[model samples]
Target: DYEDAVFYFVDDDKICSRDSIIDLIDEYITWRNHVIVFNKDITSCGRLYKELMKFDDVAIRYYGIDKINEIVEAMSDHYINFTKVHDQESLFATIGICAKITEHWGYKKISESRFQSLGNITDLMTDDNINILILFLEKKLN
Candidate 1:
């Protein structure tokens, strides 16, 4: 049944309802995606991670050392016009979304850091605001 599925990321202490599975399905349909980003404190859900990986999902993309900077630069340029998030510090997280948006509008997902992944980009919102930003970006892409 899960043959077509891939990569699953887990969080530390995630809270999910009985219908979380349904939510995943809904999100998948709405986004037509393969990436599952975790909230600041949700990267420890072992079961969730297991389920996602059962399909063949990759937790991280290890760009070659030489290619990392190039990729980051390309990503920054991609979202330079769509959103007002244009700072180098903010580019860490923004670049991921920017690259995704540029590639296919809403095709990539990333887990935000709990500490301070991107400076003003997250507004010191405990990285939780990423959840809200995710939905907002999705809507904008649509």
Candidate 2:
């Protein structure tokens, strides 16, 4: 993604300011995923639309601990309402998350310890086109 993809600007070589970057990320998390990105065109990832359609909160922002601390401290210790830290995942190119999570030993250990099966999650939209519309609508409602 770093070497080739145009939409992605972040890479190992790229750098961004702490506060300014957080501000931008916060803005995107609040608006972009719903108002901008959700309505945009998508070609691949068939189950993605249906997944987005099911969630009320359609946005999440990930940040380093230092950046998060800076924001909260600057805002008089106030943090965003719907934010959670997922135990130092490091980082990666955005691919193979389903396979990584659904077919992993660590996840198995965690799931076995703290989670229970709620049955399989099936795609709601039978085809691709309909899901695109439904997902966008669902994103806006949140």
Candidate 3:
């Protein structure tokens, strides 16, 4: 079996620069495992996730195959989409997932203009989306 490999989980709405990709691989090689790249910024996790990748391709990377599959399987059920409806609720879910994965969470208040610019606020919250948010919140709480 081949021994050396690396895998990265980059969200869909991300743009990776040439230099940043090189930096990412370098960082991963240096760290050698369980690396999560994030930017310290003032925004919701949705916006944070976007900005993290924007300035640099911020992502979680895995160097080992067995642990990679373990974390991937754990994250499988936590996957989230950009909410067509209930964008606010999706924000809750995003925060919850980040909270579950990270020890500290922080954000600064953003404007409505900023929110809209971040590809949010398409439709009102429906019961179904609320339920999804609730499920994630409950998981985070417990």
Q: Which candidate is the best by TM-score?
A: 3
Candidate 1 is scored at a TM of: 0.21
Candidate 3 CA-lDDT value:
0.31
**Could you estimate the TM-score for every candidate?**
0.21, 0.21, 0.22
Backbone clash total, candidate 2: 0
lDDT of 3 by residue, 43-123 (tens): 322322333322111122212344434433454243344454354333443433333233211122211222122222222
Q: lDDT tens string, model 1, 1-142?
A: 2223442323412324332433442232222222333222223345433333222211124333344456444543331332453432342343343323222322244322121222232332223333433443334333
Model 1 CA deviation exceeding 4 Å by range: 1-39, 50-62, 77-142
Local distance difference test, per candidate? 0.32, 0.27, 0.31
The candidate that achieves the highest lDDT relative to the unseen native structure = 1
Q: Comparing 1 and 2 by TM-score, which wins?
A: 1
Ranked candidates (TM-score, high to low): 3, 1, 2
As for lDDT, the candidate ahead, 1 or 3, is 1
